[PDB]
Amino acid sequence: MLEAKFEEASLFKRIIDGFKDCVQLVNFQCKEDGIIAQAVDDSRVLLVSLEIGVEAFQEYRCDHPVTLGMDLTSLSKILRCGNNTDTLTLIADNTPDSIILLFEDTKKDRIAEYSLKLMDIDADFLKIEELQYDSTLSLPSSEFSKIVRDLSQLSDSINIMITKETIKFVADGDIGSGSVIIKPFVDMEHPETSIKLEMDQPVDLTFGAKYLLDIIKGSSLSDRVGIRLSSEAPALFQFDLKSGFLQAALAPK
Amino acid sequence: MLEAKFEEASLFKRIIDGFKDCVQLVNFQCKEDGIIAQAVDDSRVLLVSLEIGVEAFQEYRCDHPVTLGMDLTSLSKILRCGNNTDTLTLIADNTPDSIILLFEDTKKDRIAEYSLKLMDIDADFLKIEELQYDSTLSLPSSEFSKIVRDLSQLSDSINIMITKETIKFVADGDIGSGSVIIKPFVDMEHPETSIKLEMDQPVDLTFGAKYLLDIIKGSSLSDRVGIRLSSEAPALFQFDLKSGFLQAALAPK
Amino acid sequence: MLEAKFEEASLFKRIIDGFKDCVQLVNFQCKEDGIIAQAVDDSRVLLVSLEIGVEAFQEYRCDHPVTLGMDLTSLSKILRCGNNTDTLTLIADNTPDSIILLFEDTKKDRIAEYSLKLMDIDADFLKIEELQYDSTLSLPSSEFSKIVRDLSQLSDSINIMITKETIKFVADGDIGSGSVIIKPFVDMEHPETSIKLEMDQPVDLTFGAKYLLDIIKGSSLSDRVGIRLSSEAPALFQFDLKSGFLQAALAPK
């Protein structure tokens, strides 16, 4: 039986919106260790993954490894149905055909219960990460998101080129071309605005615009974003959070 | 001759928007006692009524019971044409074919006059209210509006079930089902957040989604909303204001 | 070689949006004296003009009178691609086929360079202004813009009638008619809210709605707007700024 209780429902809503437009119909898996999720879009180019630890809740309980597939559009349609200041509780049992979400106010004057009919999803999972990549950077999520949104207006292709102490974003389309160049710096005044880069091998990889625009929707989850790039493996974007992370994998071109 | 003068035009704008999407082409009637209005939509399921007393104005004057039918879309198209900090004055005469609206600033540097061509509306009125119903509740308008908006995403049918110290809102659709349960409580810390219920007979009535979504547009008129429900009579939603009220009547199913 | 450097990019963005929906594909001309621009829409009814002096920049440099035609939609698509707190630098050379825009942050951690492919525009210019008109007024830009937006809902024709100490705006359509009357006053409490009028000959001219709605988009450029009206010459709307101005010319009816 699954009895999870978030401290606040806002976290779960933001997490769902972090890859809502990325992939739909994600098959979560709940264990006694935490909640994970892995999904691939219809085009099979983006691999989105979720990990939520026990510490992200004020009270978590589980006694059966359950697998729960549901529609992200309908799930987000339900997640907006609770007063944001209330507390959210996920409820499921052994071999279920629906998941139940309980919204409770502090003094229990109102109680909202929503039942969501599940979906039959093929239980397939993918593990492709390694310990080190050709280059590894970390930059503020808002800055990276604005960079992507700026370059998406020019073309449907965004190139990233990383050399020693140099990160470059190129985009060439019909109306013209654009280039954003950032350099690593460990600023003492503000550590969060600092861009960090570890350089092992130069990188020059082209990605799509739509997939990055959907990826950057996890900007509300973290202040920073960590990108791992290698010539052989897919680019790895990662947003960290309180005992958990969202991890997108995008194949270059 | 009708010479009404609101203290501020914002009240009239909000009142028009309280049932703007409810019913269009409402035939107001102005007497020396106040301004009332009654309208039915094309489907003839929703009966919307308005009552505005003399105290809602800083200066009211009338000497002839005039009847004035006009388009709510065009009326709202005109009501946005005055500086909100100015004062609004309704002007009409005996047997008129247009109504004149006068917007005046405090120091009279600018004067805006708008003439609205009226509509020929059949003078029909309906009085169906009684003193007591099977159950009578009153709850904050924002809470009720959010409840309706939350349940409208699931289905086009919203059931309300009232039992002793229990108000329940059910909605079952394709993606799933939802239930919001509130209990009466007279909270001392905040009297406005208190939900009040008088129980004479149990109620279990299903209503539409679109009509309730249009009804709840009078949430800007009052902090609370009073709902009267009986098995025989149509459900009565009411928003009170400064010497007046908006009153919608919706037929169950 | 053209090397202009705005104090802030916000000014240039606002200036482009001041006539963005007015005319597209405007052919700027840069001299060692300043930057000017003149454009006519496809209908050839609105003549939009721009003048930007050297003092509008913190650092301007030029050694060749260059002529630069570009698309306003694409230019505005690029102007949103720089962090608003950064500084913008226009770069061009002798006989160019593209213009380069440089966005620089204060500490130079990031540098954004955008290349815009130019357009071949016939170098035609028009000078039609004179020193005096039949009537000349100046009123707050926000007030005038709201007046235009209020009257645009009634009809596609907005008449302006100016007599001694009387400015009137008429608009008669299907649903009705509207009239906004403002009077000149030199208010001591607030000089900016004052409306000023110099009266030499009475004016009664009808203009379009769409063209005025596009003209009033320069409301973000100035607190006030100066209108010059004569029976013979086109109406002249003007927004002033820090060493420069935007000047639209609209033909009456």
Q: What is the 3-state secondary structure (H, E, C) of chain A?
A: CEEEEECCHHHHHHHHHHCCCCCCCEEEEECCCEEEEEEECCCCCEEEEEEEEHHHEEEEEECCCEEEEECHHHHHHHHCCCCCCCEEEEEECCCCCEEEEEEECCCCCEEEEEEEECECCCCCCCCCCCCCCCEEEEEEHHHHHHHHHHHCCCCCEEEEEEECCEEEEEEECCCEEEEEEECCECCCCCCCCCEEEEECCCEEEEEEHHHHHHHHHHHHCCCEEEEEECCCCCEEEEEEECCEEEEEEECCC
> Is B97 in the C-facing interface, judged by CB distances under 8 Å?
no
Distance CA B223, CA B213 (A): 17
> Is A191 in the C-facing interface, judged by CB distances under 8 Å?
no
Of A150, A181, A195, the CB nearest to C81: A150
Q: Classify residue B51 by burial, with Cβ atoms within 10 Å: 0-12, 13-18, 19+.
A: middle
Give the residues across from A208 on adjacent strands: A157
Q: Which residue has the tokens 């440099």?
A: C61
Tokens of B30: 């102005």
Distance CA C23, CA C39 (A): 7
Q: Contact C183/B78, CB-based, under 8 Å?
A: no
The parent domain of residue C144 ranges over 1-253
Q: Contact B117/C175, CB-based, under 8 Å?
A: yes
> Is B252 in the A-facing interface, judged by CB distances under 8 Å?
no
Q: Which chains touch C (3 or more CB pairs under 8 A)?
A: A, B
Backbone CA torsion sign across B200, B201, B206, B208? negative
Question: Which residue, C153, C138, C167, is CA-closest to C212?
Answer: C153
User: From A172, which residue of chain C is nearest by alpha-carbon distance?
Assistant: C115
DSSP state of C234: P
Three-state SS at B55: helix
**Distance between start and end Cα atoms, chain A:** 44
CA distance C148 to chain A (A): 33
CA distance C107 to chain A (A): 11
Distance CA A136, CA A130 (A): 12
Q: Directed axis angle between helix C72-79 and helix C9-18, to 10°?
A: 150
CA distances from C88 to C57, C104, C114 (A): 10, 7, 11
Q: Classify residue C174 by burial, with Cβ atoms within 10 Å: 0-12, 13-18, 19+.
A: exposed
Q: Directed axis angle between helix A9-18 and helix A72-79, to 10°?
A: 150
Three-state SS at C155: coil
Tokens of A195: 């861009």
CA distance B182 to chain A (A): 4
Q: Which residue has the tokens 């799933």?
A: B176
Chain C hits for B98, CB-CB cut-off 8 Å, are 176
φ/ψ of B6, rounded to 5, equals -70, 150
Query: What residues 202-231 of chain B have any CB closer than 8 A to a CB of chain A?
Result: none
Q: Directed axis angle between helix B9-18 and helix B72-79, to 10°?
A: 150
Query: What residues 148-177 of chain B have any CB closer than 8 A to a CB of chain A?
Result: 150-151, 153, 175-177
Helix then strand then coil, in percent of chain B rounded to 5, is 15, 45, 35
Tokens of C98: 């593209």
- How long a stretch of residues is chain C? 253
CA distance A117 to chain C (A): 43
Q: How many domains does chain C have?
A: 1
DSSP state of A234: P
Distance CA B2, CA B250 (A): 32
Question: Which residue, A17, A9, A57, is CA-closest to A33?
Answer: A57
Cβ within 8 Å of residue C76, ≥6 positions away: C13, C16, C17, C20
Q: Contact B78/C185, CB-based, under 8 Å?
A: no
Query: What residues 114-143 of chain A have any CB closer than 8 A to a CB of chain C?
Result: 143
Cβ within 8 Å of residue B212, ≥6 positions away: B148, B152, B158, B250
DSSP state of C4: E
Chain A hits for C74, CB-CB cut-off 8 Å, are 175-176
Helix (H) or strand (E) holding B234: none
Chain B hits for A74, CB-CB cut-off 8 Å, are 175-176
Distance CA B32, CA B63 (A): 6
Chain B hits for C150, CB-CB cut-off 8 Å, are 80-82, 112
User: From B103, which residue of chain C is nearest by alpha-carbon distance?
Assistant: C180
8 A C-beta contact, residue B3 and residue B43? no
Q: Contact B81/C177, CB-based, under 8 Å?
A: no
Of B83, B109, B114, the CB nearest to C178: B114
Backbone CA torsion sign across C4, C9, C15, C19? positive
Distance CA A205, CA B253 (A): 61
Q: Which residue has the tokens 């509130």?
A: B182
8 A C-beta contact, residue B93 and residue B1? yes
> Is B83 in the C-facing interface, judged by CB distances under 8 Å?
yes
Q: Contact B150/A80, CB-based, under 8 Å?
A: yes
Tokens of B203: 């109620």
Q: Contact A151/C117, CB-based, under 8 Å?
A: no
CA distances from C252 to C76, C103, C152, C155, C226 (A): 29, 41, 16, 16, 17
8 A C-beta contact, residue C168 and residue C179? yes
Question: Which residue, C26, C94, C10, is CA-closest to C248?
Answer: C26
Three-state SS at A184: coil
* Residue to test with chain A: of B139, B146, B151, B180, most A Cβ within 10 A: B180
8 A C-beta contact, residue C107 and residue A186? no
CA distance B38 to chain C (A): 22
Of B82, B111, B115, the CB nearest to C177: B115
Distance CA C86, CA C113 (A): 13
φ/ψ of B91, rounded to 5, equals -135, 130
Helix then strand then coil, in percent of chain C rounded to 5, is 15, 45, 35
Q: Which residues of B240-252 are buried (b: 16+ CB within 10 A; e: fewer)?
A: bbeebbbbbbbeb
Distance CA C183, CA B108 (A): 9
Distance CA A4, CA A101 (A): 10
This entry's atomic model was obtained through X-ray
Tokens of C204: 């009664």
Q: Contact C109/A181, CB-based, under 8 Å?
A: no
Q: Contact B111/C150, CB-based, under 8 Å?
A: no
Distance CA C64, CA C53 (A): 16
Q: Contact B176/A114, CB-based, under 8 Å?
A: yes
